[PDB]
Write a protein that binds this ligand. Structure first.
Ligand SMILES: OC[C@H]1O[C@@H](O[C@H]2[C@H](O)[C@@H](O)[C@H](O[C@H]3[C@H](O)[C@@H](O)[C@H](O[C@H]4[C@H](O)[C@@H](O)[C@H](O)O[C@@H]4CO)O[C@@H]3CO)O[C@@H]2CO)[C@H](O)[C@@H](O)[C@@H]1O
Ligand SMILES: *[C@@H]1O[C@H](CO)[C@@H](O)[C@H](O)[C@H]1NC(C)=O
Length: 302
């Protein structure tokens, strides 16, 4: 049904201590859990990392090469298995607590990072996770700078996932992100990535979904925005509690998207990863709540 369909793999961005230490503060996704999701039919994994850990001096400085290697190990595990890996600096438009306002340093950051993966045609690049509370022109230029840096590295074959303001929410998209339609790419492989949760405030922090139909309701206008501006999109992060109302909401959002695959290239569940424990949305096999409680709904699209 969709071009791409799978899961986020979180953990490398975990914890409050920055840089912090592996095994205590954060961890990398587990290739064998990723293999199990691939065996279920998922062809897409969006792998979270923290910029401050990849780059402990400055945005344009030296890598922590052990952290980079680890990120690369997960990417090779995804791509070796034939799936696309979407590389997600999980940073909210910010670096070291401050809004990234230097388009130039951002462009440089993305040219270096894309340089690491330019030859892996199964890799995809997400410009940044959930920009918010920042100037809308800056968000536009930040995304263009990423595109420009990526292609300047010679990463010319890979799709580039761009995110908007208001936490790239689908439900607020037309209200704030209209200028994002002006992004250009010499290769023409821009995907508009939006997120959508189904609890009352859209924060994705409660199991309760507002209603059976709230998912469809929250992506309708964005769907129409994509059509009217002749772009394609993707739901990079979405979830609902393992309960009957949420199951219908999730089910119904995916069904509506499946009726509009001219614009929706697919979706990724928030989230899998080895340290979610009893997280309400965990899709980590063998016993994540979403893994046992929701996966059947997602398999209709696999
Ligand atoms: O650090 C070691 C310690 O970690 C505990 O695991 C914690 C993590 O420390 C913490 O980083 C992690 O934070 C999650 C948070 O719970 C989610 O609500 C949030 O999900 C957001 C997401 O970040 C947005 O971008 C997305 O789109 O919206 C979602 C939905 O709100 O994601 C962050 C991860 O980025 O939470 C873990 C708690 O479960 C371990 O439990 C502990 O044992 C370890 O010692
Ligand atoms: C990289 O992974 C290894 C485990 O394979 C670990 O010992 C190391 O601490 C990891 N991350 C970093 C930043 O070193």
């Amino acid at each position: 049904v969709f071009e791409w369909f799978g899961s986020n793999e979180s953990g490398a961005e975990f914890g409050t201590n920055i840089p912090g230490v592996w095994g205590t503060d954060y961890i990398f996704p587990d290739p064998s859990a990723i293999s199990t999701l691939i065996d279920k039919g998922m062809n897409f994994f969006r792998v979270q990392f923290m910029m401050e850990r990849l780059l402990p001096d400055s945005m344009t400085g030296s890598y922590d090469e052990e952290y980079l290697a680890n990120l690369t190990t997960v990417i090779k595990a995804v791509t070796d298995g034939g799936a696309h890996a979407l590389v997600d600096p999980h940073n909210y438009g910010r670096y070291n607590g401050e809004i990234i306002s230097s388009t130039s340093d951002f462009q440089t950051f993305w040219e270096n990072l894309a340089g690491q993966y330019k030859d892996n045609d199964l890799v995809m690049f997400d410009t940044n996770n959930e920009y918010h509370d920042m100037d809308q022109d800056l968000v536009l230029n930040l995304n263009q700078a990423a595109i420009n840096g990526i292609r300047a590295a010679g990463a010319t074959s890979q799709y580039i996932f761009v995110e908007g303001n208001s936490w790239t929410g689908a439900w607020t998209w037309v209200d704030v992100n209209d200028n994002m339609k002006n992004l250009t790419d010499p290769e023409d492989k821009i995907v508009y990535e939006m997120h959508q949760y189904l609890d009352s405030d859209g924060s994705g922090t409660s199991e309760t979904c507002v209603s059976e139909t709230i998912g469809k309701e929250r992506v309708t206008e964005a769907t129409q925005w994509l059509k009217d501006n002749k772009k394609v999109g993707f739901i990079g992060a979405y979830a609902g509690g393992s309960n009957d109302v949420c199951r219908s909401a999730v089910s119904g959002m995916l069904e509506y998207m499946a009726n509009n695959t001219d614009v929706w290239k697919g979706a990724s569940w928030w989230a899998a990863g080895p340290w979610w424990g009893d997280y309400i949305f965990s899709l980590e096999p063998p016993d994540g709540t979403a893994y046992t409680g929701m996966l059947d709904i997602l398999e209709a699209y696999l």
